[PDB]
Design a protein around this ligand. Structure first.
Ligand SMILES: Cc1cc2nc3c(=O)[nH]c(=O)nc-3n(C[C@H](O)[C@H](O)[C@H](O)COP(=O)(O)OP(=O)(O)OC[C@H]3O[C@@H](n4cnc5c(N)ncnc54)[C@H](O)[C@@H]3O)c2cc1C
Ligand SMILES: Cc1cc2nc3c(=O)[nH]c(=O)nc-3n(C[C@H](O)[C@H](O)[C@H](O)COP(=O)(O)OP(=O)(O)OC[C@H]3O[C@@H](n4cnc5c(N)ncnc54)[C@H](O)[C@@H]3O)c2cc1C
Ligand code: SF4
Ligand code: SF4
Ligand code: SF4
Ligand code: SF4
Ligand code: SF4
Ligand code: SF4
Ligand code: SF4
Ligand code: SF4
Ligand code: SF4
Ligand code: SF4
Ligand code: SF4
Ligand code: FES
Lengths: 129, 284, 643, 184, 427
């Protein structure tokens, strides 16, 4: 079983974190697919639900550390949305461990690598959705 | 309040007056001292930590498990015993494989280390749980004494783990001493080691006695009347090494050695018999 | 939509892990793609020429590039397409190097599949892209320089000589910075004031420079070319326009207070002039010490004393900002083993600089704080406040070695009989002439070097000081007596640095100093456009390095002001009035207040909007949509990622 | 003669890399990052009255000079006063390195008779400093029991301590002989 | 005052100065003696203290220089005469014959593939080979081929294989005359040649290399494809020694100055070797560790802590080649106070920085004065670091003295500002 994982990362820190992990040559499983947004505040529950309905076995969202958002306060709004999404998902048979959201700074390549590896292990252990 | 009472070796086997004074003081203060039945050497870090870390850690873990079975935190009035027990406690608490090894050793004794209690120093307990105001209220007669405070190395160091007071210029023991009316006199190299730790006293007595002689020379030109310590291992070093220095080099230091508990008892008007100054080789 | 796909080998950086043949072949076969090509280095001139030729010939209206991260080369390919006529926002970037090839080396097949999926997502997004004309905004041809030290003075003079009107805000009553406090400079031992004072006078006289001393920057708003700055001028209680700096008020004043210029070892009056070469040469009254005796008021002939002065608020509009706020000297009081503040005859390097200066408090005589007598034995301790994890200072201060050696040489020059010893770990004489200066310290002046970080400094009853330290090259402990001990304190960010950093909105480096845009190639730029760094504001360094940085910052700030225009990105919210219901759950979500309500419909201000997309994500009905990040585009990308 | 062909030069024959790796893996990891400033030696009180140089011990541990370290008498001059560790600008765990080196030396047979005597006292009575008759009478006079509530009073506690000692190998290290209750 | 500037040297400093001047609106000429711009930055694999790829960040600037409307790039050329004064400089330059048409050559490289003559590549610093017709490196600007007639045999195969007709065997040197107002000298440096240090045995011992050669070897695009290999047998060394202060701080060779960068790149290359080969043992022989710059002390601590690189404080007395071609470094450990003789599979000399070849000729042509270290002297050591006492002539980068990339970049930007001021004033 090879899970399908979709990732959303903000342009300024989390996408920068993935770039840092890449430049440092930090290996991690190739299942994740990153989609760029300017801010984590651009992400809403419709995208997560569409990803899960289209065949995704896990959804990751990466944002700036609270207080480090380029756009000042988008990540707060995303955090609220993410808590509500964790509330909603289990009602339709989707474990909330399949939906992970983390704060990754532009220089935190190693944290991004570890997050990717651990999320892949979790989703694979859960099995197909 | 109830706290487990760890005696060690020197206090209960060479200088029982310190133990008697501690018991009387803690009874007066309203703190119950619970005896750690079956306790052994902590074991003294100098020899056992230097020879085999596993044996030292296992013995200290058994000592800690005694207090864990009583539910209470350990209180110790020896710098060496405090260092040994405190170091073993943080190592096992923050190290799972070492904890597993120590528990595998301890299984034969029908004991298991759980990391449930804290190791505390007599002076730290007096400063925090009691406070200086309560201690002052218990002073029946202020003392007129110039005393040299010997902090000892293992009371405050390694300070990253202990976090009691600044190891370079501490003040806790000075304040506890001065609530009694005694004046804590500054002297050169106040924070120097007494020379007894690390097994040096039994390995090279001359070097340890040189440590003690330098400290005594500094205290004497400071013009002090007594030495106050919170370590029976430093207490023994000073007391017995004064006579050893007298016999070897003929230098005559006649500075009495008092534990902090004994000084507090003197300031609290305890019987002269309870201090057991007869055990001291240097006349008080 | 005619999509042209360009997969970059990047040499072997993508090619070595990902098959740039199988990936180009898929792109040619994907719907709407009319060309698929691969080139070894697309960002290079030949690659851009290939892209332009393809656009011109095949009439491509969408360009997709499978190359490194967009954060690196998106502007490059955007200006490429335009020179060939396409709109910049019709182009898409697929990240297959940092996200695919450099992180899945052990899975080449999975890497190729991921590259295929990523290119599919990129083409899915590119299908729905539309042209967006970007708006130009004028760049004000004015500069602000914060800090009146050598670096700030250099930057202001360079900008003013290039023709730009410059403001210089300085928190102290006079400019000069720390260079004015030095007696001599290494490695030449020339007088610092003799060469700095002409520059200070130049700054004070320049037609293109507005000098605002005794003032602080309170608020900064706006962006490059369009900075609105609110400055607070503190009350001198002396009229700058009237005061001539004669100093009679100082003569008559009865109150004595420390002189900040003398670094705690010099005294002046409640009304004071920091030093004779001050610019502006004006008096200042410190009300913490003034008793309002009006003696200065009576003795002044210009009527320059104003005891009822109030703080003034100034508002300026500038195009660029240069931060040149310098540093403070490390306070070694926390190093208890060295006894600074406790031992009488322990001083710092900057205090020694003030004491050796002829105009200093002691008239240039190095005297013991205890007795007023010259020390016969002097020790210097290196790396105080630096290279020390016990105090969280793991960096080198980069100048303490050289100024320690310089002050030892000066003490030898003034008092040849004095014995001087330096306690060092490394001698970092890295600069031009620095190694020769280091050798001259030994050969000519007979200064003694001990390789050992002192363990302790002990004050003896007679107030002499025993340094207890290992001589590691002799491999033995030493306890040497000295009449004076000088701590080689390091450099730290100045007091109030965090307040100004938050006011402007800059980041800081691990050492606490301000962070440059790129460590190697943009040393004086910041990631905030229109803001630049000069001098020790960016980190410890000596005077020539700070001057070079100031000149470079002047050039970099002049570039955009010469251009006179900057482009605004058009990734902004747009409201569909026919769909919008005026629910208004979007207005409060904009931190910049870009959204208002007109005619019962949401309306976005382009100038205020920055393009976060929060409001668009919040809008339930979808009336709000972000340009270049539309909901349909992201939905198509999600669909393509899994299908 | 001053000639000595082996003591005055270091080659790969004097170096034991496994010793350095063992010390680093056992908790002396920090010694890898000494910059040899000499603050430790300057702080050492036994350094200025004996030939003991802590900085050189750290350096030799990093280099891997096992024999020079474990057989060195000065290794036993450290009182574990922790001043060096308190003042180290690189935060090297100096005392941990010293104790690991002492453990290796003890495993190599470099153990003082007095330290072995202390260990044998602990084995026999459970106390490094056992009680004597004079202290027994002193205790009885002040109302303390004749014996403290330690392994002196409870034989089962002494049995537990001896079981721990047998399990950890301490008896073999000091050469304690159970049959005759002596040291060999 | 003429509003045109001349930048001599196509390194990072010269590139930065030219780009800054062009962005300020002044028409700028750039003169580079090598076929391509980049300088020594283009030869590095990574950069300290960040270990970021040097070319990845330098190449965009080279492309910008190559396609700027306000910059005229003249590579493979030398400044022959300078006459006049500030605002009124007449400069005569000679463009050496490439024997390849710059306007026609696309740098495809077919002629290189077909050429039969092998010759050393200057970009590889004496450890890499190319053909008589060569492109110094893939990211060269201009991407154009060059024929070296010292090796060409005139077989004409390049002419046959060239589809653009860019081969020109009858080309002649060209004379160019330009009028400028300011000149920025950014001619950089050369690596010290340690052949004269007979005790270390460079040029005699097989496995003794320099730091720059190690930079080329470790570069993924270098002659060894980024593999550190013993020159003797082409296998990876298991033990590597680094020697600091080779060619610096040494009065025996008349080099009493610090080169200011060898400590940092020694540590950087040791870290890179450890990253590529974690099992390798790396030892550095140093006198002082000069980690003075921003993040440098942390870089040094990282070298010790993360990578386990060994530091021996001692200037090596000698390097002896053993019969099996391993190298014994004989040196005192001054902190152990004892002589050590340690064996290594490779020894890397931390060579210093010297003024480049032909520096004196250019200095005399312009008329500038040199400092005691041999580099160009500035007007004032403290307050005019990029000016010279000759009005209208400025210094940038290592031309003024050894320093790292950010310092050279700051100096180049400052020189651009200082040269722009007179051109802005116009009189
Ligand atoms: C003891 C000592 C000796 C030295 N000797 C030498 C030497 O011999 N040679 C040498 O080359 N270098 C020497 N240096 C280093 C030298 O001082 C610095 O390189 C140089 O002073 C840096 O200049 P700067 O303009 O960057 O900063 P500074 O000189 O610190 O000037 C900064 C200016 O900004 C102002 N400022 C700060 N905060 C604000 C704010 N919020 N708003 C407005 N203004 C603000 C300050 O008041 C000051 O006017 C020495 C340093 C020390 C400590
Ligand atoms: C082994 C090594 C490693 C290094 N590693 C780093 C590092 O990791 N990080 C770092 O920041 N710095 C590093 N440096 C330092 C760095 O290389 C220099 O700071 C930088 O290259 C200086 O650039 P420049 O343009 O001043 O000179 P150069 O790079 O030397 O460029 C000068 C240019 O001028 C040309 N030229 C010379 N003479 C003439 C002439 N007469 N006419 C025309 N053109 C001429 C040259 O051919 C060249 O194109 C390292 C240096 C070395 C030797
Ligand atoms: S476009 Fe990106 S991936 Fe391609 S060669 Fe340039 S930097 Fe490398
Ligand atoms: S206030 Fe008046 S008296 Fe004082 S310095 Fe100014 S002009 Fe002179
Ligand atoms: S009014 Fe204030 S400043 Fe003026 S003389 Fe009196 S005390 Fe001094
Ligand atoms: S420059 Fe010298 S004295 Fe200053 S921090 Fe660096 S090593 Fe220490
Ligand atoms: S949230 Fe949507 S519907 Fe509501 S006001 Fe904003 S744009 Fe209109
Ligand atoms: S996109 Fe962001 S900045 Fe723009 S209007 Fe919406 S919330 Fe405001
Ligand atoms: S103080 Fe720390 S860094 Fe300095 S020599 Fe001692 S152990 Fe090494
Ligand atoms: S712990 Fe040991 S080495 Fe450190 S200062 Fe104390 S006696 Fe010296
Ligand atoms: S000379 Fe001809 S064959 Fe050679 S690189 Fe140029 S165009 Fe290609
Ligand atoms: S003519 Fe010269 S350059 Fe061309 S292939 Fe023959 S040897 Fe090579
Ligand atoms: S930088 Fe370091 S290696 Fe280079 S000359 Fe200076 S001290 Fe020697
Ligand atoms: S920009 Fe990354 S969270 Fe707002």
């Amino acid at each position: 079983f090879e899970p399908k994982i979709v990732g959303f990362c903000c342009n300024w820190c989390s996408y920068g974190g993935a770039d840092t992990a890449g430049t440092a040559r930090m290996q991690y499983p190739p299942n994740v697919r990153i989609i760029r947004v300017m801010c984590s505040g651009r992400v809403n529950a419709s995208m997560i639900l569409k990803a899960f309905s289209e065949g995704a076995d896990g959804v990751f969202v990466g944002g700036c550390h609270i207080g480090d958002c380029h756009y000042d306060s988008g990540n707060y709004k995303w955090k609220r949305r993410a808590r509500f999404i964790e509330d909603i998902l289990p009602e339709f048979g989707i474990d909330k461990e399949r939906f992970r959201w983390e704060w990754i700074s532009a220089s935190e390549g190693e944290k991004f690598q570890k997050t990717m590896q651990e999320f892949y292990e979790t989703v694979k252990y859960l099995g197909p959705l | 309040m109830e706290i487990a009472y760890f005696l060690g070796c020197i206090m209960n086997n060479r200088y029982p007056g310190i133990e008697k004074a501690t018991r009387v003081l803690f009874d007066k203060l309203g703190i119950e001292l619970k005896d750690m039945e079956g306790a052994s050497c902590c074991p003294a870090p100098g020899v056992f930590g230097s020879f085999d870390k596993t044996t030292w850690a296992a013995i200290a873990a058994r000592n800690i498990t005694i207090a864990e079975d009583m539910g209470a935190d350990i209180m110790t009035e020896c710098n060496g015993c405090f260092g040994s027990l405190f170091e073993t406690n943080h190592l096992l608490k923050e190290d799972e494989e070492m904890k597993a090894k120590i528990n595998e050793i301890l299984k034969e004794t029908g004991r298991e280390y759980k990391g449930e209690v804290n190791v505390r120093h007599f002076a730290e307990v007096l400063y925090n749980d009691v406070g200086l105001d309560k201690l002052s209220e218990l002073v029946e007669k202020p003392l007129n004494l110039n005393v040299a405070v010997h902090y000892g190395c293992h009371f405050l160091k390694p300070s990253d783990e202990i976090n009691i007071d600044n190891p370079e210029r501490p003040t806790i023991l000075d304040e506890i001493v001065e609530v009694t009316g005694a004046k804590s006199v500054e002297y050169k190299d106040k924070m120097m080691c007494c020379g007894a730790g690390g097994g040096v006293r039994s390995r090279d007595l001359d070097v340890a006695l040189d440590f003690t002689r330098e400290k005594l020379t500094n205290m004497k030109e400071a013009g002090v009347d007594a030495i106050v310590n919170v370590c029976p291992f430093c207490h023994l070093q000073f007391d017995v090494g004064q006579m050893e220095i007298k016999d070897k080099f003929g230098e005559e230091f006649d500075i009495p050695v008092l534990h902090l508990a004994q000084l507090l008892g003197l300031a609290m008007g305890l019987p002269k018999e309870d201090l057991v100054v007869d055990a001291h080789q240097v006349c008080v | 939509p005619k999509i042209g796909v360009y997969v970059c080998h990047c040499g072997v950086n993508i090619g070595g892990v990902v098959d740039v043949e199988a990936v180009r072949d898929y792109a040619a076969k994907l719907p709407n793609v009319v060309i698929a090509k691969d080139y070894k280095y697309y960002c290079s001139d030949p690659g851009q020429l290939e892209i332009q030729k393809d656009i011109k010939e095949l009439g491509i209206n969408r360009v997709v590039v499978a190359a490194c991260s967009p954060r690196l080369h998106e502007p490059t390919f955007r200006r490429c397409v335009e020179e060939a006529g396409l709109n910049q926002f019709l182009f898409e970037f697929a990240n297959i190097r940092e996200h695919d090839s450099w992180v899945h080396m052990d899975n080449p097949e999975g890497a190729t599949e991921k590259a295929k999926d990523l290119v599919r997502m990129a083409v899915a997004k590119a299908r729905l892209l539309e042209p967006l004309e970007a708006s130009k905004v004028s760049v004000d041809d004015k500069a602000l320089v914060i800090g009146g030290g050598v670096a700030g003075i250099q930057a202001a003079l360079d900008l003013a000589d290039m023709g730009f009107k410059t403001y210089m805000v300085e928190k102290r009553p006079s400019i000069s910075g720390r260079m004015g406090q030095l007696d001599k400079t290494f490695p030449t031992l020339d007088c610092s004031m003799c060469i700095l004072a002409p520059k200070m006078v130049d700054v004070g006289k320049h037609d293109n420079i507005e000098l605002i001393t005794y003032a602080e920057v309170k608020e900064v708003d706006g962006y490059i070319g369009n900075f609105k700055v609110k400055i607070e001028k503190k009350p001198r209680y002396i009229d700058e326009e009237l005061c001539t700096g004669c100093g009679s008020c100082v003569e008559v004043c009865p109150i004595e207070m420390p002189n900040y210029f003398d670094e705690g070892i010099g005294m002046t009056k409640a009304v004071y002039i920091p030093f004779p070469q001050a610019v502006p040469l004006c008096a200042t009254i410190d009300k913490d010490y003034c008793i309002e005796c009006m003696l200065c008021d009576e003795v002044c002939e210009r009527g320059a004393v104003k005891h009822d002065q109030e703080p003034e608020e100034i508002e300026i509009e500038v195009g660029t900002i240069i931060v040149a706020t310098g540093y403070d000297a490390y306070d070694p009081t926390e190093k208890l083993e060295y006894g600074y503040g406790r031992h009488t005859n322990v001083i710092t390097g900057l205090e020694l600089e003030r004491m050796i200066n002829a105009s200093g408090p002691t008239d240039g005589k190095v005297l013991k704080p205890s007795d007023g007598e010259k020390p016969k034995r002097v020790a210097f301790i290196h790396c105080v406040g630096s290279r020390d994890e016990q105090i969280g200072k793991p960096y080198c201060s980069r100048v303490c070695c050289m100024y320690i050696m310089k002050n030892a040489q000066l003490i030898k020059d003034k008092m040849p009989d004095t014995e001087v010893t330096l306690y060092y770990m490394d001698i970092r004489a890295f600069g031009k002439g620095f190694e020769e200066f280091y050798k001259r310290s030994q050969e000519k002046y007979g200064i003694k070097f001990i390789r050992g970080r002192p363990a302790e400094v002990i004050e003896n009853p007679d107030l002499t000081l025993t340094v207890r330290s290992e001589d590691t090259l002799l491999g033995k402990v030493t306890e040497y007596d000295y009449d004076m001990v000088v701590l080689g304190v390091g450099l730290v960010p100045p007091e109030g640095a965090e307040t100004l950093r938050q006011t402007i909105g800059l980041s800081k480096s691990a050492d606490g100093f301000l962070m440059e845009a790129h460590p190697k190639l943009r040393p004086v730029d910041t990631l905030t456009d229109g803001v630049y760094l000069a001098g020790v504001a960016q980190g410890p360094k000596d005077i020539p390095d700070a001057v070079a940085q100031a000149s470079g910052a002047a050039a970099r700030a002049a570039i955009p002001m010469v251009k006179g225009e900057v482009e605004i990105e058009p990734i902004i919210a747009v409201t569909d009035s026919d769909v919008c219901g005026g629910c208004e759950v979007c207005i409060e979500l904009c931190p910049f207040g870009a959204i208002s309500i007109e005619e019962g419909h949401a309306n976005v201000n382009v100038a205020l909007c920055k393009g976060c997309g929060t409001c668009v994500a919040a809008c339930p009905s979808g009336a709000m949509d972000q340009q270049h990040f539309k909901t349909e585009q992201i939905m198509a990308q999600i669909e393509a990622a899994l299908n | 003669t001053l000639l000595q062909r082996e003591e005055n030069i270091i080659r790969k024959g004097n170096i034991d890399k496994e010793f350095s790796e063992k010390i680093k893996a056992a908790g002396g990891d920090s010694l890898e990052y000494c910059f040899q400033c000499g603050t430790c030696t300057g702080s050492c009180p036994s350094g200025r009255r004996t030939p003991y140089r802590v900085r050189q011990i750290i350096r030799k541990a990093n280099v891997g000079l096992k024999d020079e370290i474990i057989s060195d008498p000065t290794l036993w001059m450290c009182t574990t006063c922790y001043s060096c560790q308190e003042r180290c600008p690189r935060k090297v765990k100096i005392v941990d390195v010293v104790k690991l080196a002492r453990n290796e030396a003890a495993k190599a047979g470099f153990m003082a008779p007095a330290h072995k005597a202390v260990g044998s006292f602990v084995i026999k009575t459970g106390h490094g400093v056992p009680i004597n008759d004079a202290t027994m009478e002193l205790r009885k006079a002040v109302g303390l029991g004749e014996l403290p509530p330690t392994t002196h009073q409870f034989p089962e506690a002494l049995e537990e301590v001896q079981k721990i000692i047998k399990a950890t190998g301490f008896d073999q290290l000091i050469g304690y002989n159970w049959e005759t209750g002596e040291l060999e």
